[PDB]
Design an enzyme around this catalytic site. Structure first.
Site, PDB file in Angstrom:
ATOM      1  N   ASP A 273      -6.424   2.021  -1.707  1.00 40.51           N
ATOM      2  CA  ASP A 273      -7.073   1.826  -0.410  1.00 40.51           C
ATOM      3  C   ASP A 273      -7.956   0.583  -0.418  1.00 40.51           C
ATOM      4  O   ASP A 273      -7.975  -0.178   0.557  1.00 40.51           O
ATOM      5  CB  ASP A 273      -7.896   3.070  -0.042  1.00 40.51           C
TER       6      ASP A 273
ATOM      7  N   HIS B 240       0.826  -1.204   0.000  1.00 35.05           N
ATOM      8  CA  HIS B 240       0.000   0.000   0.000  1.00 35.05           C
ATOM      9  C   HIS B 240       0.866   1.263   0.000  1.00 35.05           C
ATOM     10  O   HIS B 240       0.614   2.199  -0.765  1.00 35.05           O
ATOM     11  CB  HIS B 240      -0.929  -0.076   1.213  1.00 35.05           C
TER      12      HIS B 240
HETATM   13  C1  LIG Z   1      -0.373   6.213  10.103  1.00 36.35           C
HETATM   14  C2  LIG Z   1      -1.814   5.971   9.742  1.00 36.35           C
HETATM   15  O1  LIG Z   1      -2.771   5.549  10.490  1.00 36.35           O
HETATM   16  O2  LIG Z   1      -1.751   6.520   8.531  1.00 36.35           O
HETATM   17  C3  LIG Z   1      -1.250   6.126   7.331  1.00 36.35           C
HETATM   18  C4  LIG Z   1      -1.857   5.104   6.664  1.00 36.35           C
HETATM   19  C5  LIG Z   1      -1.420   4.708   5.448  1.00 36.35           C
HETATM   20  C6  LIG Z   1      -0.378   5.338   4.849  1.00 36.35           C
HETATM   21  C7  LIG Z   1       0.206   6.395   5.486  1.00 36.35           C
HETATM   22  C8  LIG Z   1      -0.207   6.796   6.721  1.00 36.35           C
HETATM   23  C9  LIG Z   1       0.574   7.934   7.390  1.00 36.35           C
HETATM   24  O3  LIG Z   1       0.193   8.387   8.460  1.00 36.35           O
HETATM   25  O4  LIG Z   1       1.623   8.331   6.871  1.00 36.35           O
END
Ligand SMILES: CC(=O)Oc1ccccc1C(=O)O
Ligand SMILES: CC(=O)Oc1ccccc1C(=O)O
Lengths: 122, 122
Positions: free
Chosen positions: B89, B47
């Site tokens: 997502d 992801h």
């Molecule tokens: C950290 C969190 O809950 O967030 C994310 C989820 C997927 C990708 C990035 C993040 C981020 O906070 O960077």
């Protein structure tokens, strides 16, 4: 680098540095900045603003020299950026020790870090 | 945005998204990428690589359109960056669901994330 930072925090606070501060509040450890929750978190906000000014070196990876003179951390001469980096880390290690009296274990593993309210500009 | 990603994870996994995945392993949630610990962590690795290839929109903040057709998440193509973002997502929410059998509570609050072994290039 994170290795020198951790060592300073271990010696000043007596606490496991990554366990106690690696995900604490909105500003300590992994991730970025956010509205501080308490005095410990404000130490960490000031530290991340300190790192943000250092464009001439890598705060996470670059090693530097420092020593103990009795109970005082003394940053070695290094070059300009590495000396400033050492001063950032020394300052936060002292700040975290002085604020142990309000350390809050409820904030230790903040899995809501990405949803923190926006911090004031550095 | 992370709001929509959260909703996808809650519906697909039945778990509190930020609590169960917000600091999990070397790749899930806050922070960057690292050598993956297990199948759930590899979902998150894929992801984050998916987010990195997007250009022209902001994966954390930008809202996209989607809907449910029975059990199937259907991305409405807002524009091409936003369609790709939605598809990133959707894929990770389905991936985490399919690996619940291997989810390890011991990895949930990884306060050693900055020390993870460097990830391979995406
Ligand atoms: C950290 C969190 O809950 O967030 C994310 C989820 C997927 C990708 C990035 C993040 C981020 O906070 O960077
Ligand atoms: C979370 C942690 O242990 O790392 C840091 C400490 C100070 C400043 C930055 C970091 C980081 O990981 O980004």
């Amino acid at each position: 680098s994170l290795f020198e930072l951790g060592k300073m925090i271990l010696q000043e606070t007596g606490k496991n540095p990554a366990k106690s501060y690696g995900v604490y509040g909105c500003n300590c450890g992994v991730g970025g900045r956010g509205k501080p929750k308490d005095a410990t978190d404000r130490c960490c906000y000031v530290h991340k603003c300190c790192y943000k000014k250092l464009t001439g070196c890598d705060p996470k990876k670059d090693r530097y020299s420092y020593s103990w003179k009795d109970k005082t951390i003394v940053c070695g001469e290094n070059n300009s950026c590495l000396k400033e980096l050492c001063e950032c880390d020394k300052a936060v290690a002292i700040c975290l020790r002085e604020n142990l009296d309000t350390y809050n274990k409820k904030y230790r593993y903040n899995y809501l870090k990405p949803f923190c309210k926006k911090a004031d500009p550095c």
